[PDB]
């Protein structure tokens, strides 16, 4: 009961009985890109349109055709092609597909350079009866130059089954011609789509980009270009079909309004929607309202709704409007789609490549070697308004740890600066510090450390850092961020390499190796499966008089300190004086303390400026796992030691391991040559 109603391939002239009128039409080739079509050329005087005969349409009737308007990237609201119908023999005309959520049956210039297939299901929207159709642009006096347009391959008749899932053309309502990659007699089966999308616009991710150029106007991110929807006509951006079955997120930057004050009420919202059927039907993901607080560029991260999860979902940003005219524009930047629901436990990298699925964002960062690294590192060296790197989401549990090689400027500058290190459990909508600034003020802690661990003097050159991940980082989707807080000079460079965040190497290679694919690669002088057997004898003793230069056979790190006489005799001769403006930190080589009894040294405060308060007291801590964890031995109280005193401490049994190291560090001071301290005649024996 469902006859084919109209079919025209125009492929050597049209079929006369299909059409009542085609003023302005010719047969030929327009825009040989996406053979014979019905072209409506600019120059042609009078009405530009084409009208079908009267047709008995029913519940099952669709209109399907190919079209190209303008063959350009020039979005305009002028001389669009309207698909319309008439129940009164052309007396009056109406949009076949009104505007609502979905755009009207109006086809604007610039939407896509190439040809596109379109389909409207008449019978779902409108009642059966005797009906007339047309594709109308307008009526043009001689001289007018409206955009050129064309239709091809027009079918009016019964819909195919399931509408071919949106991924095919319908022949006569019985057979589907599936788009490349789609198969099955209904176009249902989908070839493996990508499960990831990233667009910075600094450059196939999109099917259409209508109504928007890449611009620097109205910017959020001062690295570069954004997508600016300032034009007229249709404002819409549409992704390729994506596998989102296991995706976690859609995130992007977005600004609503680009004006002096508050965007006006009549501004239509921006709609984020999804489609599992090639564009045929759209479900709302998020409405974005223009409001008194919208005229500001901001970060939007959303979780993937359950209903969007399929091996073939596409997304769109669309701003509705009656006549392709708008009150306030909008901007969009840094679009990422992806993640994993399995939210895996291991993110690992040596940066031979820079995979964006692991490193969502890296503004200011370059894949390059620096500072004698192994191959490339991720490097923040170039001129930047911003420097940071955000990881993708991984699942963090009891056995999870962060391990990275870090380097600051590598003797380029002598600036004192710190790289913030943060974590997020809400997809980067808010960041918290990984290591929270804690000191012997309360049992509120038993480990002691500073918020700012990654400091420029300590980390001048490559230094490994291993952190067991705190309980508050445990979630299914924790991402990490390295952040250089502005303002900052260019020459405050930094870099990361050999990143392992995960749970694959239990015990953390004992502090003497790095985890690489669930296996430990040990530091030199160490072997074994977990790096706990040393290759040679570690020294059983540490003695230092500081009458000569601190040696690399005694100390791994000396920050903020130099040999001086400024304190007078602390023990005798020169002492190691700490009065620097950045870190003040002293760290011993690993020592075999199997048979060791004590640690001792002479000690004085304020050779220059007397310490001001408690938190400025030097702490003495020990580690039996390569500095991964530190155990307080002594708070060297601030108000004590105004003249040189002697400190003698018995080693606790747990400190007497085959590889123990010590550190003295000041958590706080008023800066250069303030709250200073000195140590002489260190003895561990």
């Amino acid at each position: 009961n469902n006859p084919v109603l109209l079919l025209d391939t125009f492929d050597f002239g049209p079929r006369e009985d299909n059409w009542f009128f085609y003023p302005g039409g010719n047969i030929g080739l327009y825009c040989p890109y996406s053979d014979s079509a019905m072209v409506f050329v600019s120059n042609e005087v009078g009405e530009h349109s084409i009208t079908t005969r009267d047709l008995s349409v029913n519940e099952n009737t669709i209109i399907q055709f190919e079209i190209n308007v303008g063959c350009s990237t020039d979005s305009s609201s002028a001389d669009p092609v309207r698909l319309e119908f008439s129940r009164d023999f052309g007396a009056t005309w109406h949009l076949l597909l009104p505007l609502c959520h979905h755009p009207s049956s109006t086809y604007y210039a610039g939407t896509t350079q190439g040809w596109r297939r379109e389909v409207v299901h008449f019978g779902k929207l409108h009642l059966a009866g005797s009906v007339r159709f047309r594709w109308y642009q307008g009526f043009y006096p001689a001289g007018s130059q409206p955009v050129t347009w064309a239709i091809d391959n027009v079918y009016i008749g019964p819909q195919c089954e399931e509408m071919c899932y949106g991924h095919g053309s319908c022949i006569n309502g019985t057979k589907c011609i599936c788009d490349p990659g789609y198969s099955g007699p209904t176009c249902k089966i989908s070839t493996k789509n990508p499960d990831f999308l990233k667009d910075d616009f600094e450059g196939d991710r999109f099917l259409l980009m209508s109504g928007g150029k890449p611009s620097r106007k109205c910017g959020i991110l001062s690295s570069g270009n954004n997508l600016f929807f300032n034009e007229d006509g249709l404002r819409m951006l549409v992704t390729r079909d994506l596998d989102l079955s296991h995706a976690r997120f859609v995130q992007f930057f977005m600004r609503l309004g680009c004006g002096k004050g508050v965007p006006d009420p009549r501004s239509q919202p921006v709609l984020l929607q999804y489609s599992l059927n090639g564009g045929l039907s759209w479900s709302l993901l998020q409405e974005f309202l223009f409001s008194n607080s919208s005229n500001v560029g901001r970060y939007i991260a959303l979780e993937m709704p359950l209903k969007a999860r399929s091996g073939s979902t596409r997304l769109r940003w669309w701003q509705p409007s009656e006549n392709g005219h708008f009150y306030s524009p909008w901007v969009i930047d840094q679009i990422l789609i992806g993640g994993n629901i399995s939210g895996n436990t291991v993110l690992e990298d040596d940066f031979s490549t820079l995979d964006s699925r692991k490193w969502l964002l890296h503004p200011g960062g370059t894949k390059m070697p620096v500072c004698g690294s192994t191959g490339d590192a991720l490097v923040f060296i170039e001129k930047a308004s911003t420097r940071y790197v955000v990881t993708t989401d991984i699942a963090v549990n009891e056995d999870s740890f962060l391990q990275i090689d870090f380097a600051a400027s590598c003797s380029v500058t002598d600036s004192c600066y710190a790289i913030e290190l943060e974590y997020s459990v809400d997809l980067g909508l808010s960041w918290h510090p990984l290591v929270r600034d804690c000191l012997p003020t309360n049992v509120e802690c038993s480990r002691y450390h500073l918020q700012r661990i990654l400091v420029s003097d300590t980390f001048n050159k490559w230094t490994r850092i291993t952190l067991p991940l705190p309980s508050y980082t445990r979630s299914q989707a924790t991402r990490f961020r390295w952040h250089q807080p502005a303002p900052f000079d260019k020459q405050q460079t930094w870099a990361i390499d050999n990143v392992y965040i995960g749970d694959g190497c239990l015990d953390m290679c004992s502090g003497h190796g790095r985890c690489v694919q669930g296996s430990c690669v040990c530091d030199e002088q160490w072997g074994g499966l977990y790096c706990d057997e040393p290759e040679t004898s570690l020294p059983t003793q540490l003695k230092d008089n500081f009458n000569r230069a601190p040696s690399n056979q005694n100390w791994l790190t000396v920050s903020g300190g130099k040999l001086s006489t400024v304190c007078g005799a602390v023990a005798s001769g020169l002492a190691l004086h700490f009065s620097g403006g950045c870190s003040r930190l002293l760290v011993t080589v690993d020592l075999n303390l199997t048979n060791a009894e004590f640690i001792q040294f002479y000690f004085m405060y304020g050779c220059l400026i007397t310490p001001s308060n408690r938190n400025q007291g030097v702490l003495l801590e020990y580690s039996v796992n390569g500095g991964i964890t530190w155990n307080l031995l002594m708070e060297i109280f601030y108000d004590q030691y105004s003249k040189p005193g002697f400190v003698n401490i018995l080693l606790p049994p747990d400190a007497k391991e085959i590889a123990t190291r010590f550190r003295w560090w000041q958590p706080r001071h008023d800066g250069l040559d303030q709250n200073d301290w000195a140590i002489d005649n260190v003895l561990i024996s």
Binding site: P369, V370, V412, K490
Partner: protein, 35 residues
Amino acid sequence: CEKDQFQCRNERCIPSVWRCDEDDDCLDHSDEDDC
């Protein structure tokens, strides 16, 4: 001077990646002269 470095007419050495970046890193803008 180092390989991943560029020698200024200062005798000064800078990272070669600072050559041609609209900042004067040599202090005699010889890192910017030929771009």
